[PDB]
């Protein structure tokens, strides 16, 4: 399905640290960037996620803060 | 200050399209990826930021969803 | 793309409140319930959304709070 | 309290998945719709939530995305 | 309504910066702390918010990040 | 780093509830107020957080709702 979210970044799953209700999925999206996503275990199974899966990090623009040194 | 957020991606501001109270800053984070950030104009003033500034897109892991094809 | 968000509620657009950069879209999801979503006007244009369009309200489980009535 | 969040959908809890710190409450809100909510275990205790309790899924308008079929 | 969000901080509104669809309200929550909230102008109308209003800053635990000094 | 987030409230950690992937850190921020924050266990290690650490609750303005009686 097509999503309204402005951040939709392709990457590959390089870690999945499983837990009770939630889990943390890490995507390498190129450029030496990794995005970590905390989602429910139910979703990790439902989408089939495994180390090496192709995926997208989806982030709403209002979820992004800016920082500087 | 050092932040708990799992996602802290360094990038350069490639555009900043202003609006009334809010504003949308776009960061090139390398690998040809861009992050769009909606933050209040007060913060855009306070942090300085100009097209070409070094900055960070900071995203909490709980803000990221995963999608697949 | 298929999404990890546990809440993906089918509905029809019943209103679109335009603004300069943003807008408020309301979806009738059946059962007499409506969802409101604040998204960028750019996404509403790019997505084709119009009053009467079929769409989905997509919500992450961590974004939802639970409430109970004042007498519980 | 009366809450600023734009989405407040009434329903009955059909499951509560307990975990270490967090848990998932599922609401039937009628019309064949269910909302899943990930909240802390402390709130599920304090709110008295049990299977069959009447409750509300509360969602900010800014937390909702729109999707369409491609 | 009774709320699951653990952060429910009583305070008084000290300013309201109005905008097109949304607006920013600032609350004094005691201890010398101020919390800023961006919510739709529709909710600021519906709750009647004014400088001097009693209100609550409501924040979900999953929205709060932790920071420390270098 | 200097952050765009409107809410940065100084406090001391009063408990830390450990979990699988996440944990809940509570801050005394003065005025008898406590902020509860659910963040990843990796962030809790990395920041060194212990009961009694000085820290900040950092919250985006768009994450905050208002309620009245």
Residue numbers in the entry:
A (entry chain E), B (entry chain F), F (entry chain D): 1 to 69
C (entry chain B): 1 to 72
D (entry chain A), E (entry chain C): 1 to 70
Extract from the study:
Here, we characterized E. limosum Tub, a tungsten storage protein. Tub has a sub-nanomolar affinity for tungstate and contains a single TOBE domain first characterized in a molybdate storage protein. Crystal structures revealed Tub assembles as a hexamer composed of a trimer of dimers, capable of binding eight tungstate oxyanions at two distinct binding sites located at inter-subunit interfaces. Tub enables E. limosum to accumulate W and then supplies W for two tungstoenzymes needed for conversion of lactate to SCFAs.
Additional X-ray crystal structures of rTub occupied with varying amounts of W revealed that tungstate accesses the internal type-2 binding sites through tunnels that are closed after binding. With five tungstate oxyanions bound, one tungstate binds to the type-1 site and four bind to type-2 sites. Based on the occupancy and B-factor statistics, a binding model of tungstate to Tub is proposed. Tungstate simultaneously binds to type-1 and type-2 sites indicating random binding, except for the final binding site located within the trimer center.
